[PDB]
């Protein structure tokens, strides 16, 4: 008829990017149900902006080599997925990497645009060897709900939109004075920094709530 | 930047069994609402089912009605599955009466404006001797999930009616749930999906009623999920009782005569924290108390160690 909603919920955060939220006392089975369902939405269908396509300056194929770079073409592509991008009013922005010379290319070494915000200018993109070594390329960010692989693009970089790097829910037993077995739900989460774990969940749950706008009274 | 689903055809196919379908579904939400609905449908759904029962000439489950071919323990176990549905009411006591060599079905009950015997063929027991005769007070409440008989004694406090056989409570009308999302393209959309949630009732929840109150819980749960106020409790309760706790117990505990028992009902005195402070003065002037009537109260107050009529410039503190 009427239900149980939790009390005492302590989010204990380690670093600003990583965080662990515990939340008791749920009715029986409600840890797994809220837990798994929030996990699914946190991982799969969560709006984000990552790098989707890359046209390079010097060479056409994903099996070629750039002079002045020890990072292979497949290598920098990996580094790109790991750059955390957030666009403001813009749905699509594309950046130019103009930097050259003996030494490593950070992200503060990117062009700084108006609706562009690099969450880590410290982030290591690729290294440059001796002499001059020229490198500037155009790399196009895209907007989407999820993680979209390079393979799913048929007519290229895996697009890791969602802010979630990792999620796990661990369900253990909680007692309410004279109730025997209730669930205590522990959510642990890591983010790409474009949004803090605490808020990630809020909207994560908000989404699922939105989907029930059809049945509740 | 998202869509939201809704429920197209709900397709009954039996009183017991029906496929409800949910059309506008995005990629993967199919299994997401789908598993998480099976989860909240198999458990958390409302249901009424017979809780206690008194039967004519029987004292406990392990006996034998004359002229019936079941044993009381079996007859209980037939009611556990008696499928009833009632409305405005929360607990309704149906009555069963029938004699003569003949199968007593569920239909043989008496009807209330709220009573709907969702299966009237349902066998309850068989009589078997012309003038053998049974009569019973079947009691139905309505709760959530599985309250087995046993846990239904910690509230005790006089359930004495020896006749009342408590039956384990199986309060739920889900039998078995199964969703399957087959893919469904609304004419233009790249790929959205369907969600056929097939379900199996006892007959006493109409699919739509269900699948709705199901989604409802999910909301109120996720409600607290949305923002996270780290919330907590005050705690640290009191370790300072002034008086002797004895004065917070009701006047029953005095184990007194009935004419003196209801009479303290009368003059507005429950707890003995009030009997303690009403003198002998107060008592002839009280409706129906006398020499034999009040001699009684000075003797059970004597035995527990208290007296009639005193003070306490502080009664009663404080929560």
């Amino acid at each position: 008829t009427e239900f149980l909603k939790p009390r005492l919920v302590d989010i204990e955060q380690v670093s600003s990017t990583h965080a662990k939220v515990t939340l008791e006392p749920l009715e029986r089975g409600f840890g797994h149900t809220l837990g798994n369902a929030l996990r699914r939405i946190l991982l799969s269908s969560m709006p984000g902006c990552a790098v989707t396509e890359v046209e390079i300056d010097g060479v056409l194929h994903e099996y070629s080599t750039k002079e002045g770079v020890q990072e292979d073409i497949l290598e920098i592509l990996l580094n790109l997925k790991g750059l955390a991008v957030r666009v403001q009013g813009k749905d699509e922005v594309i950046l130019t990497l103009n930097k050259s010379g003996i030494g490593p290319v950070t992200a503060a070494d990117i062009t700084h645009d108006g609706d562009v915000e690099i969450v880590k200018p410290q982030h290591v993109i690729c290294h440059l060897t001796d002499e001059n070594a020229s490198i500037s390329m155009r790399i196009k960010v895209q907007r989407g709900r999820g993680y979209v692989p390079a393979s799913t693009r048929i007519h290229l970089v895996d697009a890791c939109y969602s802010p979630v790097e990792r999620i796990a829910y661990n369900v253990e037993a909680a007692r309410v004075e004279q109730r025997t077995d209730l669930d205590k739900l522990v959510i642990e989460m890591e983010t790409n920094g474009t949004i803090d774990p605490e808020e990630a969940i809020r909207r994560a749950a908000t989404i699922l709530a939105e989907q029930l706008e059809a049945f509740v009274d | 930047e998202f869509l939201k689903p809704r429920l197209v055809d709900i397709e009954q196919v039996s009183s017991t069994h029906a496929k409800v379908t949910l059309e506008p579904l995005e990629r993967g939400f199919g299994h997401t609402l789908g598993n998480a609905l099976r989860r909240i449908l198999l458990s958390s759904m409302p249901g009424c089912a017979v809780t206690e029962v008194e039967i004519d000439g029987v004292l406990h489950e392990y006996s034998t009605k004359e002229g019936v071919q079941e044993d009381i323990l079996e007859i209980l176990l037939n009611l556990k599955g008696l499928a009833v549905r009632v409305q405005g009411k929360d607990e309704v006591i149906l009555t069963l009466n029938k004699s003569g060599i003949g199968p007593v079905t569920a239909a043989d009950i008496t009807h209330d404006g709220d009573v709907e015997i969702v299966k009237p063929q349902h066998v309850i027991c068989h009589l078997t001797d012309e003038n053998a005769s049974i009569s019973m007070r079947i009691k139905v409440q309505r709760g959530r999930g599985y309250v087995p008989a046993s846990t239904r004694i910690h509230s005790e406090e006089d359930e004495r009616p020896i006749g009342r056989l408590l039956v384990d409570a199986c309060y739920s009308p889900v039998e078995r749930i199964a969703y399957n999302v087959e893919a469904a393209r609304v004419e233009q959309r790249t790929d959205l999906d369907k969600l056929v949630i097939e379900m199996e009732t006892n007959g006493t929840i109409d699919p739509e009623e269900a699948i709705r109150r199901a989604a409802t819980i999910l909301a109120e749960q996720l409600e607290a999920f949305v923002d996270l106020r780290d919330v907590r409790q005050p705690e640290v309760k009191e370790e300072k009782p002034e008086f002797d706790p004895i004065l917070l117990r009701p006047v029953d505990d005095l184990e007194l005569t009935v004419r003196s028992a209801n009479c303290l009902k009368a003059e507005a005195i429950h707890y003995i924290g009030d009997l303690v402070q009403r003198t002998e003065v107060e008592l002839l002037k009280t409706p129906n108390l006398g020499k034999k009537s009040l001699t009684e109260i000075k003797d059970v107050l004597a035995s527990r160690g208290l007296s009639l009529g005193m003070r306490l410039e502080n009664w009663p503190p404080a929560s």
């Binding site: 797994h32 798994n36 | 299994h31 789908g34 598993n35 998480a36 099976r38 989860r39």
Partner: protein, 50 residues
Amino acid sequence: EIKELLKLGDLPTSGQIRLYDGRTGEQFERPVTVGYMYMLKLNHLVDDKM
């Protein structure tokens, strides 16, 4: 003779089917066997031993 009787019941010869974890709702890789086994409760019941 067992497999032949499985056909009539319209059930797979594997003796195995796919199952789905009730919690996460997802498939179990591999078939697991399901079936019916007559089982006893022996009277070393706990609340006599404890």
